């Protein structure tokens, strides 16, 4: 048999756990185990993650003592999470996401012990604003590459997005290991505890703040729109019998109408309409 | 490769200076005898 273009399903909770723990020990590397199920011949599902005692340093990690790990499975098992481990993960503080030569020597033991165990790598300080740098890998054996045989099998959903990074391509990409596609199967119920939740209100829908804080805002915006308008008038009086191509020719900035004139109008309309409507509702809902 | 300046005796902690880096407290490796390590001579050092 041989592998194909398969997949990894990670629960939302395990993602939050990995991000949080990785960011906690920021000046040093961190590592942990992960638990799940090989649900079929080619997907793998990871449900939960827990850390372990470790002797961190700015470029490497080792786990301290085994008894902790052996115990915690037996604890969790009697409150309804019996799954064994499926793999492990660690973090790279500032570098790219890729495997070191010692990670190979670690990984070979898992692969020798269980056939499919993925390895996961996370970057906590490139994942800064609105994206996550997380990835999953597995080894390729040396001798097979020398033989004509290639690593895997092909069906058409291999090629989306999965352009490898040049930084990763400098190390043993392909030559020593291959990437696996990842996706987040957020099932129902936990969907709503986020969407309908992190932002909300109730009585806030009916608040007025009708003092000067409003009138002063109006008398700032209209005041500056006076000058915007005078500018636009001057900026159109040219009326030269030229061609709008020449207008684009010299066009560089501060295109009055679109650049500024209109956003002030939209802001002023929004504020005043909403305020008047809210006052008109409260005048009837209460006595 | 670096040098050693003050060998603690009967106390396995050694002190080293890179002459370009700072001074670290360090020790010996597994295979090397602790006898023929006279203080004040050039030694090879692991990067990690």
């Amino acid at each position: 048999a041989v592998d194909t273009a398969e997949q990894v399903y990670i629960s939302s909770l395990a993602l939050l756990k990995m991000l949080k723990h990785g960011r906690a020990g920021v000046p040093m590397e961190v590592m942990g185990l992960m638990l799940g199920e090989f649900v079929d011949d080619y997907t793998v599902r990871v449900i939960d993650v827990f850390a372990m005692p470790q002797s961190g340093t700015g470029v490497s990690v080792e786990a301290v003592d085994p008894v902790f790990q052996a115990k915690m499975l037996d604890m969790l098992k009697q409150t309804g999470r019996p799954e064994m481990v499926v793999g492990w993960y660690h973090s790279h503080p500032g570098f790219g996401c890729w495997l070191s030569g010692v990670d190979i020597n670690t990984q070979q033991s898992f692969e020798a012990l269980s056939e499919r165990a993925v390895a996961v790598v996370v970057d906590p300080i490139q994942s800064v604003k609105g994206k996550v740098v997380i990835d999953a890998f597995r080894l390729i054996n040396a001798n097979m590459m020398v033989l004509g045989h290639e690593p895997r099998q092909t069906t058409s959903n291999l090629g989306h997005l999965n352009k490898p990074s040049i930084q990763a391509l400098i190390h043993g990409l392909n030559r020593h290991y291959y990437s696996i596609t990842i996706n987040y199967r957020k099932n129902e119920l936990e969907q709503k505890m986020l969407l309908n939740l992190h932002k909300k209100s109730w009585m806030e829908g009916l608040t007025l703040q009708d003092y000067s804080e409003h009138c002063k805002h109006n008398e700032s915006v209209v005041k500056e729109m006076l000058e915007l308008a005078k500018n636009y008038n001057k900026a159109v009086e040219e009326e030269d019998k030229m061609t709008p191509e020449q207008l684009a020719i010299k066009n560089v900035g501060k295109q009055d109408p679109k650049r500024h004139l209109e956003e002030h109008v939209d802001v002023l309309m929004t504020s005043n309409i909403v305020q008047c409507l809210a006052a008109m509702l409260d005048t009837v809902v209460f006595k | 490769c670096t040098k050693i300046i003050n060998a603690d005796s009967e106390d396995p902690k050694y002190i080293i200076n890179v002459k370009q880096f700072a001074k670290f407290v360090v020790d010996l490796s597994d295979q090397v005898a602790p006898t023929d390590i006279e203080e004040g001579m050039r030694v090879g050092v692991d990067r990690n």
Binding site: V59, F95, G101, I104, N105, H171 | -
Partner: peptide
């Protein structure tokens, strides 16, 4: 004897930084 003299300059040595080792030993 007034002074309108000048001088040379030595360099700034501190430039090195550590890098991640990438040894491959099984």
């Amino acid at each position: 004897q007034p002074s309108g003299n000048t001088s040379s300059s030595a360099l700034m040595q501190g430039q090195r930084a550590p890098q991640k080792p990438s040894q491959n030993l099984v």
